A paper describes a structure:
In the pathogenesis of Alzheimer’s disease, the overexpression of glycogen synthase kinase-3β (GSK-3β) stands out due to its multifaced nature, as it contributes to the promotion of amyloid β and tau protein accumulation, as well as neuroinflammatory processes. GSK-3β abnormal activity leads to hyperphosphorylation of tau protein which results in the formation of neurofibrillary tangles and the loss of its fundamental property–stabilization of microtubules. GSK-3β activity also plays a significant role in the modulation of immune response within the central nervous system (CNS). Given the multifaceted role of GSK-3β in the processes contributing to the onset and progression of Alzheimer’s disease, it represents an excellent biological target in the pursuit of disease treatment.
We identified compound 36, demonstrating an IC50 of 70 nM against GSK-3β. The most potent compound developed in this study is 36 with an IC50 of 70 nM. Kinetic studies confirmed a competitive type of inhibition, allowing for the determination of a Ki value (Ki = 60.3 nM) consistent with the IC50 (for details including Lineweaver–Burk and Cornish–Bowden plots see Figures S26 and S27 in the SI). The catalytic domain of the new GSK-3β crystal structure adopts the characteristic bilobal fold. The electron density map shows the phosphorylation of Tyr216 that supports the active conformation of the A-loop, forming interactions with Arg220 and Arg223.44,45 The ligand’s electron density unambiguously determines the geometric orientation of compound 36 in the catalytic pocket of the enzyme. The compound occupies the ATP-binding site formed in the hinge region between the N- and C-lobes of the kinase domain. The aminopyridine fragment is oriented toward Asp133, Tyr134, and Val135 of the hinge region. An additional favorable contribution stabilizing the ligand in the hinge region is provided by the CH–O H-bond between the Asp133 main chain oxygen and the C(2) hydrogen of the pyridine ring, reflecting the tridentate harboring motif in the adenine binding region. The thiophene and the 1,2,4-oxadiazole rings are coplanar, with the latter located in the phosphate-binding region of GSK-3β where the residues Lys85, Asp200, and Phe67 create the anchoring motif. The 1,2,4-oxadiazole ring is capturing Lys85 with an H-bond and the thiophene ring of the inhibitor forms favorable London dispersion interactions with Cys199 and Val70. Although the position of the ligand in the pocket is entirely clear from the solved electronic density, the relative orientation of terminal groups cannot be unequivocally determined unless the resolution is <1.0 Å.47 Two orientations are distinguishable for the 1,2,4-oxadiazole: (i) the O atom in oxadiazole is exposed to the solvent, leaving the N–C bond oriented toward catalytic Lys85 (N–C orientation); (ii) the O atom in oxadiazole is turned toward the catalytic Lys85 (N–O orientation).
Author numbering: 36 to 119, 122 to 295, 300 to 381
Write the structure that this text describes.
Amino acid sequence: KVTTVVATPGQGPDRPQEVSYTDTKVIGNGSFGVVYQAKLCDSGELVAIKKVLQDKRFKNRELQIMRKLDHCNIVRLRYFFYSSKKDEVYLNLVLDYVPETVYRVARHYSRAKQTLPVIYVKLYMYQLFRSLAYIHSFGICHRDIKPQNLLLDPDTAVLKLCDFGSAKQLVRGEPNVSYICSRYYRAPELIFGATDYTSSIDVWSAGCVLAELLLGQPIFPGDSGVDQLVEIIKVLGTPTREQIREMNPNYTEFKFPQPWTKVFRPRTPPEAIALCSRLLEYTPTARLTPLEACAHSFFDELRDPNVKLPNGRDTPALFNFTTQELSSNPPLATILIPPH
Ligand SMILES: O=C(Nc1cc(-c2ccc(-c3ncon3)s2)ccn1)C1CC1
């Protein structure tokens, strides 16, 4: 049937208006609770409702971040409402329903042994670094960059950052947990038990999803944090004593105490391999900033005026830059916004 509730509009002021929707179905689950998909009775727009349980004697870090974020490549928080077993409540996050994720379209290609077109790979990754450079400016680290958290529309080719329950405003001094992120996309510093990491861990996970697109399979598949490090050393090579010191110092076992360059599939664009190399660096500082990655030579086909999607539709919102977005090296604005 239909259901109406009083929700405070996200990002906007505290003016709880009434929202009514129908046709609710579960599109996902998790430890937080469950995410639904409903249809707003007005305009018939399909949304997503994330029912996360929360103790009333606190404040959801996700909700605080989502209300302070507004970017084309980030799923906007439309509204939010509570619908609660004593000192607890269920926080429901109403967001725009993006119809697909990068993992699903990547799996559909992997099920047929076909590489995703580089045009798709270049547009998705660029929209990822654009959302990263946005959230990284405010000092927020997603801490869960994965293809399942990279929503995408098939027609408009618009990608948006999905989850934010693992994100935290990384401040100086404040120690944060190490065992974060998905294993296949976890940075090496987190495996070594570093509590002083920066937002460059999202860049490592960005380099991992890039390789998964140019290879049809996860680049670093392990069953444990230690096993994940063996996959990294097998490809990236043995980290030197400086890089092991650039991250947290710790001793670790291994299957053996043993850097193949030819790892990517044939016909892989060399410009992407150069980008993926600057992203998957042992040293967290050598990793390109999300804005520095946007200005890479691999993202030059999109910066061309005559760029167009396969279905004839023009390039989606590729520019639309803000001063906050360019807080890291504003000089690079001419490469992020060509005269085109
Ligand atoms: O899920 C699907 N669309 C979908 C999802 C979301 C989400 C937002 C937050 C989410 C979450 N947080 C933790 O865990 N999940 S999920 C938003 C919009 N559309 C269908 C198409 C595949």
